[PDB]
Ligand SMILES: Cc1nc2n(c(=O)c1CCN1CCC(c3noc4cc(F)ccc34)CC1)CCCC2
């Protein structure tokens with residue numbers, strides 16, 4: 109039966125709604141409770157999850173109500189523009205949250221002391237508020253012109269963004285520009301991390317060369333010279349983390365400055381083991397940045413690929429009003445809108461897959477074990 113089609117569409121819509129709300133609430137709880145997940149990127153991801161939850165709680169159920177009424181808007185006229193504004197607001201906020209994550213992490217890894225433990229919570233919160241304000245500013249044209257003009261938000265009785273200029277400018281400002289920025293920033297990030305690993309290997313090379321020089325030293329002058337080169341290398345290798353290693357090298361360097369050559373050589377001998385350990389630690393930190401980069405790239409790819417069919421079909425239907433068939437186009441737009449909405453529910457599953465802390469948190473939350 110063809111009414112069974114409406115029943116199935118509404119049912120699958122409800123499935124997507126419940127999945128979105130539940131998963132993003134799980135992400136909210138994970139970021140709100142775990143102190144192991146309290147850096148800037150996780151604050152951005154929790155803001156992202158609340159945005160997706162607001163989308164799945166205020167916008168997607170109204171879309172289900174719309175698809176139940178034969179796509180005829182049953183609510184008051186102003187609520188159509190309000191609902192389109194909220195929809196565009198939350199989706200634009202999501203994509204620009206992703207863009208801000210990419211850019212912020214890139215700018216961070218640019219800073220030569222970005223491995224220090226001192227990160228400010230308030231700065232990340234201010235960035236999140238700035239992104240939400242950007243989203244509100246991008247979405248304001250719909251309330252401005254939509255409440256003034258009933259025709260720009262209504263399309264044959266149906267509550268759709270009918271202005272072609274609005275559609276194209278919103279596709280560019282809200283989807284295409286942040287997508288391109290995301291791609292560029294991601295590839296620049298992989299290049300910067302490669303540079304980081306290369307510099308770390310160079311620091312290790314310097315450390316080994318000067319340890320070997322110290323092992324065969326004769327007088328205090330060359331001991332101090334090799335220890336100075338070692339101190340520079342070790343300070344560079346920490347990427348601002350801040351450890352005992354440079355302090356131990358300074359202890360050996362004091363021994364060298366006093367003229368004690370044998371004791372300085374013994375100190376360098378202990379430093380050899382300490383240096384191997386710390387170098388491996390720094391390499392592991394770089395590898396962790398690489399893994400986080402790839403996971404966030406998976407997130408970006410899933411979101412963009414799931415929203416791409418809708419934007420493709422929408423811009424195409426704006427271009428060809430009669431060249432292309434519009435019944436199949438309307439069916440495609442329905443299906444692709446709901447795929448893009450499914451993108452909002454996909455994220456917590458991805459957090460579960462490639463993150464052990466998120467997965468443990470969710471496994472303990474399903475059983476209510478806090
Ligand atoms: C409910 C509905 N139902 C129908 N149609 C609709 O367009 C709609 C509106 C669908 N909104 C979903 C979010 C979109 C969006 N805005 O900004 C973004 C930025 C992003 F990164 C990703 C996505 C977006 C804009 C449209 C037309 C066919 C008939 C049924």
Ligand SMILES: CC(C)CCC[C@@H](C)[C@H]1CC[C@H]2[C@@H]3CC=C4C[C@@H](O)CC[C@]4(C)[C@H]3CC[C@]12C
Pocket residue numbers: 151152154155158233236237240244
């Ligand atoms: C705790 C941290 C990490 C997240 C903070 C999220 C804050 C900044 C977000 C969450 C929900 C957001 C609000 C959701 C909806 C609207 C309606 C819009 O027309 C004006 C902005 C406004 C009022 C948003 C302001 C920013 C907001 C309050």
Ligand SMILES: [Zn+2]
Pocket residue numbers: 217222223304347393394397
């Ligand atoms: Zn780093």
